[PDB]
A paper describes a structure:
RuvB-Like (RuvBL) proteins are found in the domains Archaea and Eukarya, including humans and fungi, where they exert roles in transcription regulation, DNA damage repair, cell cycle control, stress adaptation and disease. As constituents of chromatin remodeling machines, RuvBL1 and RuvBL2 are involved in epigenetic regulation of transcription through the deposition of H2A.Z in nucleosomes flanking nucleosome-depleted regions around promoters (SWR1), by remodeling nucleosomes in order to increase DNA accessibility for the transcription and repair machinery, by enabling progression of stalled replication forks (INO80) and by the acetylation of histones H2A and H4, increasing chromatin accessibility (TIP60).
The crystal structure of the full-length human transcription regulation factor RuvB-Like 2 (hsRuvBL2) in its apo form was determined to 2.89 Å resolution. The structure shows a hexameric arrangement of monomers similar to other structures in the RuvB-Like family. Moreover, there is an outward-facing mobile unit composing the external region of domain II, linked to the ATPase core by two β-sheet linkers. This unit is absent in all previous crystal structures of human RuvBL2 and is observed here for the first time. Despite the fact that all purification steps were performed in the presence of ADP, no electron density corresponding to this nucleotide (or segments thereof), could be observed in the pocket.
Author numbering:
A (entry chain A), B (entry chain A): 43 to 147, 160 to 184, 188 to 202, 228 to 252, 256 to 456
The structure:
Amino acid sequence: SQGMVGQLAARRAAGVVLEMIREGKIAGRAVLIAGQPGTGKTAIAMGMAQALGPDTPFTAIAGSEIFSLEMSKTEALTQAFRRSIGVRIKEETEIIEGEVVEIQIKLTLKTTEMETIYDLGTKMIESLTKQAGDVITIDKATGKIPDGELQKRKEVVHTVSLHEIDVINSGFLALFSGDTGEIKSEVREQINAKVAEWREEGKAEIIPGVLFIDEVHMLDIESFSFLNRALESDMAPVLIMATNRGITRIRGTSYQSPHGIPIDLLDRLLIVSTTPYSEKDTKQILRIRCEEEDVEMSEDAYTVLTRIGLETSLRYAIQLITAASLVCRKRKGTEVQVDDIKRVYSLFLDESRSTQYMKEYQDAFLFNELK
Amino acid sequence: SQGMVGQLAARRAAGVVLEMIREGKIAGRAVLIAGQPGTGKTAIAMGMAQALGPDTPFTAIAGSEIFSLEMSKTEALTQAFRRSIGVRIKEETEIIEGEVVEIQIKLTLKTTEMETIYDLGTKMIESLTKQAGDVITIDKATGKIPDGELQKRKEVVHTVSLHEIDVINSGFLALFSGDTGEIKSEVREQINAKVAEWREEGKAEIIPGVLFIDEVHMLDIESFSFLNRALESDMAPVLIMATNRGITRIRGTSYQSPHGIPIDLLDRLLIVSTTPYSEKDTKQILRIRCEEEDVEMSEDAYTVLTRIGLETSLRYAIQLITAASLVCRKRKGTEVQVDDIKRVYSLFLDESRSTQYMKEYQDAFLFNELK
Ligand SMILES: [Mg+2]
Ligand SMILES: [Mg+2]
Ligand SMILES: [Mg+2]
Ligand SMILES: [Mg+2]
Ligand SMILES: [Mg+2]
Ligand SMILES: [Mg+2]
């Protein structure tokens, strides 16, 4: 584990894809992550974005989320793609770094090569109040920590997605306003042009990110045509789809097809697969979520919760970590124990027990009926 | 029973959820109450709102109620969410409290520290007509019941839902007017802005309440996308859904799914379940509804009506309380008896007997046919 747990084979395949992307040998190609749910597909796609760069746009959606009352399928996909396409701007900031020589209430700084007196404002004096070398950024303040020049320059790369720029140009309770969440079509075409001229001027760079679409089988034929068209664009992001369906109907038609994907799009897919998490992987993941939530848990508790993860889902086992720690705090305990796990397991149902919620009452009802 | 009866396990689970809400560990999470109908699900959700505060907005809808001739699905949900989001305003009222020293027809009040003469209007004199210490609110009147100052200040917190404000800004027979029941989209965005500036000024506070959606399986995929988006908002209420369906189709698609809910939304659900009411719980509830309706009922009558509640539904047994008391009043009786229960049970059908209404006539018809 160097960022995530398990899924060694899938990660290995993902690595080969990353080398295709860097070598440019993935033009007009997308990825499909087959496998059952809860096998770390999102982690795979997310880690691929990071592998391309520290600030690579990553967007994760679900197939069902393009059918909404707030947007059209076209608008939903457009936003999904514009969140995954980054614009990289270089900010050039001036930074005065030097050794403090004197303060007068004028600031005299020096490097090993020069010395200068800088006028001091009221905000600077106070800021300064809160003979050793430091840093000062212009139109800003101090950062107490030099040779060469006193005023040097530091670069600050900024990465912003096309969608982020859409919002800046075009929010509180906006969801509950009743009006759609569309972006004006004439605003995007203004931003598409502003970003086009900046790129021609060399002031901006386009960084195609990673768009992850889970439950891709929920898309209909119209939406797949959109995706297929996007893979032919030169600025498109790395498309990654996922589904646990084998063969199924193509929504919008009466035709079966592998994963419910039309052939024109299947033809350009690199298919990978994830397997279910082993007993070791499951406990490893559980341990990592406990540290993140600052939850101390007994070893007998890890064993039980791990078993629950294998018998139900890793998503469900993680829910119980938050619940068990509260049950632990109520009894003034210091670490989650097996009893805490048993209680929350009885209080909160997993998807399988929830779909058969009476079977537990029928058993009890019959068990008492025999008395 | 400290507010409601039975459902100890479900209430226990609900309590653990309340601690998550208060600790903030429920971001992007909703609740699903599985179980059969008539098991106090609404009471659970309602009690959770009260547990958050005395004036926490609570809204209860049914899945089928978003499909109407008066609103669109978007409008129906928007109102449902805006009824569940509260705006808390602090009114600062001046209250003169002091000991009456003299009346002149001028009112002289005093505390243990000061004394003052207040001019008296005609309304005040009359109001006063209807040497001991009392209270007076300015621009109002008297409340006959002190040290410190004479004019003190009392705070009156006011809680109003976003929807209540929508109506104030935007009624008799409005339902039968033929025109839709929409709120102008430009009016909400004006109220969203007025509430936004008040909050920035510290004059208003947003109180996310509790939205309860029963029969959630009636929602279609478009509506579930809306809910999933709302759980990502920071001002959203605590969403609570319910259904007695196990696995069923996702309306708008041809795919089965647990409770007819898409996975993107299932993934973020804490599932609880309610069991059927026991014989003891059922009689307890019946006793409480009698006191509320001011109905005296014999113990042999409670036993019979309780049995009816177990064999049909608690909703139906409660209907018979109103009917039986009228049958009781007709015969000039003082308390409902078994006979009163037997009569109304024969006069008013439960859902099961109503769906087989001829079987009672066929039995009688055949019974006479044999004579
Ligand atoms: Mg594995
Ligand atoms: Mg369709
Ligand atoms: Mg599960
Ligand atoms: Mg019970
Ligand atoms: Mg429909
Ligand atoms: Mg009934």
